[PDB]
Amino acid sequence: HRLRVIRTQHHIEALVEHRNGQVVVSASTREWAIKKHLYSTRNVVACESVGRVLAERCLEAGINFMVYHPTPWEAASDSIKRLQHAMTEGGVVL
Amino acid sequence: QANDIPVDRLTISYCRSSGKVNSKAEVRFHLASADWIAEPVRLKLAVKHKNRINRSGELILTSECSRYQFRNLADCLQKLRDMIAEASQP
Amino acid sequence: IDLGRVDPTQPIDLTQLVNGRGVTIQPSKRDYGVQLVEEGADTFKAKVNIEVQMASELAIAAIEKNGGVVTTA
Amino acid sequence: PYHKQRLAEYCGLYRDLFHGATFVPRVPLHVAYAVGEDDLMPVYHGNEVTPTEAAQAPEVTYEADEGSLWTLLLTNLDGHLLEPDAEYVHWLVTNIPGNRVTEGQETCPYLPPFPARGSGFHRFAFLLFKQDKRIDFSGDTRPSPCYQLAQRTFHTFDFYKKHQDAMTPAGLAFFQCRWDDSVTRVFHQLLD
C-alpha cells in the first residue's frame, strides 16, 4: 500500500490507494476542519491532526505496513517529518 | 526424557501412496494415560505441542522419509523423544 | 526365498548364489566386494542368514528386523 | 463527511456486499464489545479482533429511540463446508425497542465465531434495519446453541428481499476475524 500526500497553499490531503486504483481510505484538511472546527489554513499542527486521523482510520480499517514516498527536495521539511512522526505515533510499522 | 519408547503402549497405522512412491507412518496414543512420561512433561506436551492434538485423540504424529516402515516409525519416535526432551528441560 | 531355493542357514553362501544364476560375473573387476542396497524389503520372509563383505545400514536394519543374521567379513 | 467515507469503505472492499444488494448505510452505528475490565471496540468497518472476546454478546448503540422498532442481524461467511454464496448467520434479533437488545425478541441466539485453520480473514457483518411495524416471521427455524443446516443458505437476496420489503438497511457494521486456539473447544461442543 502507498500513501499519496498532496500539499497545497490552503489545505493538504492524504490518500491511500489499492493496486486497482480504488481508494482504501482518505484524510483531508477541509472536511475535518468543518467537523472539528480546527484552523483551516495549512499548518504543521493541522498536518499532525490529519496524520493522526489517517492513522486511526487505517488502524480501524486494518491497514498496516504502508509505503510513504515524498519528493526528494521537500522531504526534509518539518511538516512531512512531523507527518511521519504523527503516523509512526499511531503504532504503525514503516 | 525417555529412550526405549514402548511402542506396544502406542498405536501404529500405515498409509502408502502410488504415482514418486511414498510410505507414510502414523503414530497415535493417549498422552494423559501414558505412565512412561513424567508428570510435567505430559501437561507440557498438552499445551505447547497441542497443535498435534485433537478432541477425539491425544497425540497423533505422521512422518515419511524412507520407503521402509520402521524407518519412518523411528522418525516418529525420534520426534517424540525430541518433544519430550524439550518439554522436560533444555 | 520364494523360488524354493535353499532354506537352511549353514549351506547358504555366495557360491550357492552363483549356482542359482542370481549373481553377476566380475572377471574384469579386481578386488571385488559384495554390498546390499535396500529394496523390495517390505514384509519379506524371515529366518535367513546372509554373509556379505560390507552391508549398508538399511540392509542390516531390514535383515535384523525380521530376525535375519548379518555376517560382515 | 463520515457518511461518504462509510460508503467508500463499504463498496470499496467486499464484493459479497454487492451480491447481497444491501445499500450503503447512512446511519452512525456504534458497536462496543465489553468483557470484564477490557473493552474491544470494532467502530469503523474492517476491524480485526480475536474470537476470544467475540464469544460474548456485544453492545449496540445507534441514535436510541425507545418509541421505535428495529431489526438486528449478525452474519459471517467463511464459506464453511459448502459451496460459495451460502451465508452463515450467527445472530438474528427482531422487534427491538430502542438500542436495547434485551427487550428485543431473539429468533437466532448469539453464536460465537468458529473459523477454520488457514481459512484467512472472515467478514463479520452487523445488519440493522428500520421497522414500520412488527413483522411476524413464520416458517423460520428455532435454533439451538448447536445447529448447522438451518444457519446456512441464509444469503441476503433470497431473504432480505423476499421476506420483508418494508425493512431498509439503515445501520451497518463490519469487522474481520480469523482463527484462534479456542476453535477446538467450540468444535468439540458442536460434535456433542
Q: Report the half-sphere exposure of B5 (CA within 13 A, side-chain side).
A: 19
**One-letter identity of residue D170:** A
What gap in Å lies between CA D167 and CA D165, rounded to an integer?
Answer: 6
What are the chain D neighbours of A26 within 8 Å (beta carbons)? 5, 8
Residue in the block written with cell 552363483? C18
What are the chain B neighbours of D184 within 8 Å (beta carbons)? 54-55
Nearest to A22 among D12, D47, D176 (CB): D12
Q: Which parts of chain A fold into alpha helices (H)?
A: 29-35, 44-60, 78-88
Question: With an 8 Å Cβ cutoff, is D190 touching chain A?
Answer: no
Superfamily per CATH, domain A1-94: Ribosomal protein S11/S14 (3.30.420.80)
What gap in Å lies between CA D156 and CA D154, rounded to an integer?
Answer: 6
Residue in the block written with cell 532354506? C7
Q: Find, among B59, B61, B71, the residue nearest to B22 by Cα.
A: B71
CA distances (Å), D30 to each of C34, D71, D99, D170, in order?
A: 81, 15, 10, 13
**One-letter identity of residue B68:** Y
CA distances (Å), A25 to each of A18, A42, B83, D46, in order?
A: 9, 21, 47, 12
Pairing of strands D47-49, D171-177: parallel
Is the CB of residue D74 less than 8 Å from the CB of residue D124?
A: yes
**One-letter identity of residue B5:** I
What gap in Å lies between CA B73 and CA B25, rounded to an integer?
Answer: 6
Distance from CA of B43 to the nearest CA of D (A): 17
Using the beta-carbon criterion (under 8 Å), do D1 and A31 form an inter-chain contact?
Answer: yes
What are the chain D neighbours of A35 within 8 Å (beta carbons)? 1
Is the CB of residue C62 less than 8 Å from the CB of residue B68?
A: yes
Q: Report the half-sphere exposure of C57 (CA within 13 A, side-chain side).
A: 3
What gap in Å lies between CA A87 and CA A69, rounded to an integer?
Answer: 14
Q: What strand order describes the sheet that includes D38-40? A: D38-40, D30-35, D59-61
Using the beta-carbon criterion (under 8 Å), do D188 and B50 form an inter-chain contact?
Answer: no
Distance from CA of D188 to the nearest CA of B (A): 6
Interchain contact C/A (3 or more Cβ pairs less than 8 Å): no
Q: So where are chain A's domains?
A: 1-94
Q: Which three cell numbers stand for residue A8?
A: 497545497
Give the angle D13-D162-D124 at the CA atoms, nearest 5°: 30
Using the beta-carbon criterion (under 8 Å), do D12 and A57 form an inter-chain contact?
Answer: no
Resolution value, angstrom units: 4.9
Domains of chain D: 4-190 (3.90.280.10)
Provide CB contacts within 8 A for B37, sequence distance 6+. B2, B31, B45, B84
What gap in Å lies between CA B73 and CA B7, rounded to an integer?
Answer: 10
Question: With an 8 Å Cβ cutoff, is D176 touching chain A?
Answer: yes
- Name the experiment that determined this structure: cryo-EM
Question: With an 8 Å Cβ cutoff, is D1 touching chain A?
Answer: yes
Question: With an 8 Å Cβ cutoff, is B50 touching chain D?
Answer: yes
Using the beta-carbon criterion (under 8 Å), do D46 and A62 form an inter-chain contact?
Answer: yes
DSSP string for B18-86: ----EEEEEEEE-STT-SSS-HHHHHHHTTTTGGG--SS-SEEEEE--SSSHHHHHHHHHHHHHHHHHH
Is the CB of residue D123 less than 8 Å from the CB of residue D14?
A: yes
What gap in Å lies between CA D131 and CA D171, rounded to an integer?
Answer: 12
What gap in Å lies between CA D92 and CA D87, rounded to an integer?
Answer: 13
Is the CB of residue C43 less than 8 Å from the CB of residue B23?
A: no
Using the beta-carbon criterion (under 8 Å), do B69 and C41 form an inter-chain contact?
Answer: no
Q: Report the half-sphere exposure of D135 (CA within 13 A, side-chain side).
A: 21
Size of interface B-D (CB pairs under 8 A): 6
Distance from CA of B71 to the nearest CA of C (A): 9
Using the beta-carbon criterion (under 8 Å), do A62 and D5 form an inter-chain contact?
Answer: no
* D90: number of Cβ within 10 Å: 19
Instruction: Quote the longest CA-to-CA distance of chain C.
Output: 36
Q: Report the half-sphere exposure of D115 (CA within 13 A, side-chain side).
A: 24
**One-letter identity of residue D152:** R
* B24: number of Cβ within 10 Å: 15
What are the chain A neighbours of D8 within 8 Å (beta carbons)? 23, 25-26
What gap in Å lies between CA D24 and CA D18, rounded to an integer?
Answer: 10
Distance from CA of A93 to the nearest CA of D (A): 17
Q: Which chains touch D (3 or more CB pairs under 8 A)?
A: A, B
Phi, psi angle pair for B89, to nearest 5°: -175, 145
Is the CB of residue D156 less than 8 Å from the CB of residue D21?
A: yes
What gap in Å lies between CA D175 and CA B47, rounded to an integer?
Answer: 29
Using the beta-carbon criterion (under 8 Å), do D187 and B50 form an inter-chain contact?
Answer: no
Mutation to test the D interface, candidates B51, B53, B55, B58, most D Cβ within 10 Å: B55
Provide CB contacts within 8 A for A29, sequence distance 6+. A10, A11, A12, A13, A40, A42, A46, A50
Phi, psi angle pair for B13, to nearest 5°: -130, 140
Distance from CA of C66 to the nearest CA of B (A): 11
DSSP class of residue D27 equals B
Question: With an 8 Å Cβ cutoff, is C41 touching chain B?
Answer: yes
Mutation to test the B interface, candidates C36, C37, C42, C60, most B Cβ within 10 Å: C42
Q: What strand order describes the sheet that includes B59-63? A: B11-17, B22-29, B59-63
